[PDB]
Design an enzyme around this catalytic site. Structure first.
Site, short mmCIF file in Angstrom:
data_model
loop_
_atom_site.label_atom_id
_atom_site.label_comp_id
_atom_site.label_asym_id
_atom_site.label_seq_id
_atom_site.Cartn_x
_atom_site.Cartn_y
_atom_site.Cartn_z
CD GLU A 131 -12.76 -32.91 3.03
OE1 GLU A 131 -13.54 -33.76 2.54
OE2 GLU A 131 -12.82 -32.57 4.24
CG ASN A 172 -9.41 -26.67 4.36
OD1 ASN A 172 -10.45 -27.16 4.81
ND2 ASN A 172 -8.37 -26.38 5.13
CG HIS A 209 -10.16 -32.99 11.55
ND1 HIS A 209 -10.39 -32.54 10.27
CD2 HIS A 209 -10.99 -32.29 12.35
CE1 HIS A 209 -11.33 -31.60 10.30
NE2 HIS A 209 -11.70 -31.43 11.56
CD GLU A 237 -12.10 -28.34 8.34
OE1 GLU A 237 -12.60 -29.41 8.75
OE2 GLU A 237 -12.25 -27.95 7.17
CG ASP A 239 -11.20 -31.99 15.58
OD1 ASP A 239 -10.43 -32.77 15.01
OD2 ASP A 239 -12.36 -31.81 15.16
#
Length: 301
Positions: A131, A172, A209, A237, A239
């Site tokens: 990030e 990432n 996300h 990641e 979701d």
């Protein structure tokens, strides 16, 4: 566990893995371990490899949790993605209080080298920098950027390559889900520039996300991320709020359409253990049973 493995099915389609985030606290409770053994082929430590967990006090390392995960994954034939060397969150105060460039540079390099060396040759890829971008595409003003400057990124990657040349080195980030997003364009542009300068960046990780209905956008966003020229790209990641099969199948398809996408990691096994459990965004429900989206991904594969 579901009778059909999304990992084995994606492998049959020519990809490397379909994995999940986990740690010792999950592996020793519920049905987590059995589900991971049967249906997935890769694990990312949810918290055990973060700075606060591994170096809570300068030079006083703690590897208990991380060691448990690595040994468990090896014994069970699961690939491992090392999760997060340099990040502004879950960072101890002793690190954040440093204002001297030379002191912080050595602290950062020692943290990277110590963790990567302990597991040299056992980790497929590492999220070296996490990030680092603001929503407008500019670099996030963290202690590392503020004290060391822009060079902290090249320094972090160079150090990581030296520590374990076998590992794929990733940058990432999240909100790289729409091809038109300012952040998406920025990371593609910056990664091309860093690679042109010789910075060893092997992959771009897209957290993914998502909100309900957003899956369709990654069909176009992923090819764009792949245009930066990195050997790999990955959904790291995943979701999705509501967990609709339409959103999940679209993300899986985006990865199948992009040659350099090596795999997908979903952020958790069962809904109640999600960082945003209220949205029931995972593939297994509170009773550890596979949800419609799991079956839809299986049929699609």
């Amino acid at each position: 566990a579901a009778a059909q493995s999304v990992d084995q099915l994606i492998d049959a389609r020519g990809k490397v893995y379909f994995g999940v985030a986990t740690d010792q606290n999950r592996l020793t409770t519920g049905k987590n371990a059995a589900i991971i053994q049967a249906d997935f082929g890769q694990v990312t430590p949810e918290n055990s490899m973060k700075w606060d967990a591994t170096e809570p006090s300068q030079g006083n390392f703690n590897f208990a949790g991380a060691d448990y995960l690595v040994n468990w994954a090896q014994q069970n034939g699961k690939l491992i993605r090392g999760h997060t060397l340099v990040w502004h969150s879950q960072l101890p105060s002793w690190v954040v209080s440093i204002t001297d460039k030379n002191t912080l540079t050595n602290v950062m390099k020692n943290h990277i080298t110590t963790i990567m060396t302990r597991y040299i040759g056992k980790i497929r890829a590492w999220d070296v920098v996490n990030e680092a971008f603001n929503e407008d595409g500019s670099l996030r003003q963290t202690v590392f950027n503020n004290v060391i400057g822009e060079d902290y990124i090249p320094i972090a990657f160079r150090t990581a390559r030296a520590a374990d040349p076998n590992a794929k080195l990733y940058i990432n980030d999240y909100n790289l889900d729409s091809a038109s997003k300012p952040k998406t364009s920025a990371i593609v542009k910056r990664v091309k520039k860093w690679r042109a300068a010789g910075v060893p960046i092997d992959g771009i990780g897209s957290q993914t996300h998502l909100s309900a209905g957003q899956g369709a956008s990654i069909d176009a966003a992923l090819p764009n991320l792949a245009s930066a020229g990195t050997p790999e790209v990955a959904i790291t990641e995943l979701d999705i709020a509501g967990a609709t099969s339409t959103d999940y199948v679209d993300v899986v398809n985006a990865c199948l359409d992009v040659d350099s996408c090596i795999g997908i990691t979903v952020w958790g096994v069962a809904d109640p253990d999600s960082w945003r459990a209220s949205t029931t965004p995972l593939l297994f429900d509170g009773n550890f049973n596979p949800k419609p989206a799991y079956n839809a991904i299986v049929q699609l594969l």
